């Protein structure tokens, strides 16, 4: 009677990847095919599950989630797409993500494949609640102010130069889109530097996020929207490519933000009880 | 309310066209007419003004108990001095905060001499924030007030923007950042540019090329006065005040309302703490006495 | 019932005004009198100390259990070893961070010669906000912990600008702005301001601004186990000298609960400041 689970399988295990494995089980319309890393890795201590070094090993897979690093995943997704599988990435670079749909679009339109991209925390979720304020106030400014927690290129950034080891960068909102970065131990907003004894101890994976829109529905001014959420920032990610995923399987070939995908699409349920539940 | 207070509005600008709603719904008030350059009488008739004497002098209204004037800041104490002159009372939300006590001695001059009464700087920021600041100061002598007004367009310092070489349309922004301090956020319409600062250098300022800085105007507007201070000797005494309003809107209504009370002053120029808040209300002393003390 | 504990105020100034109305209200402590300087003796009495023993010297308080500093921070240290020598207990709330650790020591060998305690630096941000920062550490060991301290008066900053040039009076302010930094904000009866983002205005009347109120606030964003993203937030919005004297004031009773030495405010259990049976406090607050 009912429907066969959605096989994943989860590319690249690191940060994003441990949580997208905790989403796969949970999601009940989905089961776990496997884990592909890179063969360094296989060769690593081992954290039941096939863990490979290429897809074809784990069988048949319906949508492959992409947890590899921002550059590499492009590349990696064409090669999955051309195979027949579905991808899911979050990518995060804003100003490449045209592109790269184009770049996407084109392999996956021929192999009958779905690719969703930039499925993320703020490529992704953030821009749905972004383009509906849009609609409902086409007058106005919105800023998105990313509360305090880390920020991982930045500190990354300053991993590489040269000084006491190890370094923590965060980016601070200081309000209507600007922010201040503090680092603990890239000149064009005021920095503060505080040197620490352990670095790693200030680490946590939380992050605020508060957006908001002031502008005019019609001709009408002062509407006020505001959205705020303090969450697991991979936990979020993660989740939310394990929906984009269930989304994958509804579509035609090509390449999609999430924009660009009806939001019904992504639950996982019935559609008329879904709409009598949330509608 | 038998025979009501006939009011001219003096430019049809931003706030003349709130006024001019504020008007329609004030049930002791009647439009005269609207008062414009003679340039925007050649320009096309908007469809509000159907059926609505506009013209280029009060004398063509006929009978005016008060004009309020939506004159930019720079024109308005002239043009409330002529009126004045004609026994017209005026209502004006100049908002110059340093040349306000000038400004009120010059009015008082003209008006008392003619009979009229002057209500001046009666809008938000000058004007209901000025009489909320002034209830908190005697509430609690010392400490500090701070005034934040939310973002929301400074036009004073945005059409300052678009005066300056290279710039096609500029909008400029006031963002409150604490402590009565602001920052400045530019958004252009076209390092790189000559930008420097024409003045705006005494303020942290942030500059960005937009494509259509129309798409980003919204004329509403936040504003958060704080106090902490002293009532007699006990410290720590803490006011808060916040409104999140449509700013013309609510400027034009404080003009109405203000324009009821000068109705009922001695000639003289005033300011907002001047006058009973009972005077800028409708109806009876004793039902709003019984339904507001 | 037990006899009261005789308390001492030494130095009647900002905080030892506040300190009399803190032992007054106290049911289990009573006023043996007020120590000044000499100096201070010669002037006329205040109306408040009307029938209180006001003295030159704590020998002529009588029995005198403990002694509460409210005298200037550099005096402090050298003012509790004189009174502890004499096993009578001390309370302070010297404010100096960076000294802490070597007034403790200091003070702790003094304390252990005479059988008596001192607690230090117990106040409010030396004091009970380091009490609330220690439990949100242990709560969540990861992550960071930012201390804002809401608009209001400074100490040294205050003094710092009254001296220099043609400063008549002048009030310095540290204003938050987020993630633990500050702003400066200066209030003067001339470009010179060097000694952080500042801000100048000239006033005619620096003591209209003056009022004894801040607020704090204490945010924290870490790890509790491996579970990431436990927020824990923490305010106060108080008159600074009531609540540093009422500090004390607990602390002196906590310090007749201690074994000789000098304590920190993270070094003694809470229920120690507490008025009243130890069993009944657990039931009605743990
Ligand atoms: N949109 C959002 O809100 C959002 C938020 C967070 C993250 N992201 C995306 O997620 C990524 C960051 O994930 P993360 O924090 O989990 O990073 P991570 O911990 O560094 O994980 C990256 C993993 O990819 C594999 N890998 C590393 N270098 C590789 C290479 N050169 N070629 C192929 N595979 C490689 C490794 O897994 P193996 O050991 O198994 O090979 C590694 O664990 C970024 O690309 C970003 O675009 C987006
Ligand atoms: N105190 C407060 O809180 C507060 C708040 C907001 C604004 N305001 C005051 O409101 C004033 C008007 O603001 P607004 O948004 O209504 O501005 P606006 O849209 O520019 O309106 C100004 C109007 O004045 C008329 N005008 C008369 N003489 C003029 C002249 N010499 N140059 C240009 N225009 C002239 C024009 O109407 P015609 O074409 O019909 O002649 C014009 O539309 C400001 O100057 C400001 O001081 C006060
Ligand atoms: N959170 C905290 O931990 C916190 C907060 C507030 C205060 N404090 C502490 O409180 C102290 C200041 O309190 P306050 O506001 O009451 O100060 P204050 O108003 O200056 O009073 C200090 C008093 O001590 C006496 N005194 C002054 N100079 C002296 C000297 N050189 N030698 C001996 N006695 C002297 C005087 O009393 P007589 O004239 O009667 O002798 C004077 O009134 C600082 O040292 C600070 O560390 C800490």
Same mark, same amino acid.
């Given at each position: 009677?009912?429907?066969?689970?959605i096989?994943?399988?989860?590319?690249g295990?690191?940060?994003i990847g441990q949580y997208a494995?905790?989403?796969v089980?949970?999601?009940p319309?989905?089961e776990?095919?496997?884990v592909?890393?890179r063969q360094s890795?296989?060769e690593?201590?081992?954290?039941?599950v096939?863990?490979?070094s290429?897809?074809?090993?784990?069988?048949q897979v319906?949508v492959?989630?992409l947890?590899?690093?921002?550059?590499?995943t492009?590349?990696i997704?064409?090669?999955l797409?051309?195979?027949?599988?579905?991808?899911?990435?979050?990518?995060d670079?804003?100003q490449?993500?045209?592109?790269? @749909?184009?770049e /996407?679009?084109?392999? +996956?339109?021929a192999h009958?494949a779905?690719?969703?991209?930039?499925? =993320?925390?703020?490529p &992704?979720?953030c821009?749905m609640? @972004?383009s509906? /304020?849009?609609?409902? +106030?086409?007058?106005?400014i919105?800023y998105?102010?990313?509360?305090? =927690?880390?920020?991982? &290129?930045?500190?990354?950034a300053?991993?590489?130069?040269e000084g006491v080891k190890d370094?923590?960068?965060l980016?601070?909102?200081?309000?209507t889109?600007?922010?201040?970065?503090?680092?603990?131990?890239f000149v064009?907003?005021?920095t503060?530097?505080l040197?620490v004894?352990?670095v790693?101890?200030l680490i946590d994976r939380?992050?605020?996020?508060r957006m908001e829109?002031?502008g005019?529905?019609?001709?009408?001014?002062?509407?006020?929207?505001?959205?705020?959420?303090?969450?697991?920032?991979?936990?979020?990610?993660?989740?939310?490519?394990i929906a984009?995923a269930?989304?994958?399987?509804?579509?035609?070939?090509?390449?999609?933000t999430?924009?660009?995908?009806?939001?019904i699409?992504?639950?996982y349920?019935?559609?008329?009880?879904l709409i009598?539940?949330?509608?």
């Amino acid at each position: 009677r009912t429907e066969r689970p959605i096989r994943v399988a989860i590319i690249g295990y690191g940060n994003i990847g441990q949580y997208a494995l905790q989403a796969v089980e949970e999601a009940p319309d989905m089961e776990l095919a496997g884990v592909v890393r890179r063969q360094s890795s296989l060769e690593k201590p081992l954290p039941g599950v096939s863990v490979v070094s290429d897809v074809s090993a784990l069988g048949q897979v319906d949508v492959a989630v992409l947890c590899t690093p921002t550059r590499e995943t492009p590349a990696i997704a064409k090669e999955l797409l051309a195979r027949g599988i579905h991808t899911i990435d979050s990518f995060d670079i804003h100003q490449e993500i045209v592109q790269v @749909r184009h770049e /996407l679009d084109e392999v +996956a339109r021929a192999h009958q494949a779905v690719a969703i991209l930039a499925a =993320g925390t703020d490529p &992704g979720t953030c821009s749905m609640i @972004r383009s509906i /304020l849009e609609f409902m +106030a086409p007058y106005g400014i919105t800023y998105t102010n990313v509360g305090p =927690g880390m920020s991982m &290129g930045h500190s990354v950034a300053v991993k590489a130069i040269e000084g006491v080891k190890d370094a923590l960068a965060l980016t601070i909102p200081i309000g209507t889109g600007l922010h201040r970065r503090m680092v603990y131990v890239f000149v064009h907003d005021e920095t503060h530097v505080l040197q620490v004894d352990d670095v790693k101890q200030l680490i946590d994976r939380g992050i605020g996020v508060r957006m908001e829109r002031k502008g005019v529905s019609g001709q009408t001014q002062n509407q006020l929207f505001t959205y705020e959420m303090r969450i697991n920032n991979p936990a979020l990610t993660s989740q939310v490519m394990i929906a984009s995923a269930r989304a994958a399987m509804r579509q035609k070939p090509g390449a999609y933000t999430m924009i660009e995908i009806p939001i019904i699409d992504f639950l996982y349920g019935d559609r008329d009880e879904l709409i009598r539940r949330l509608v």
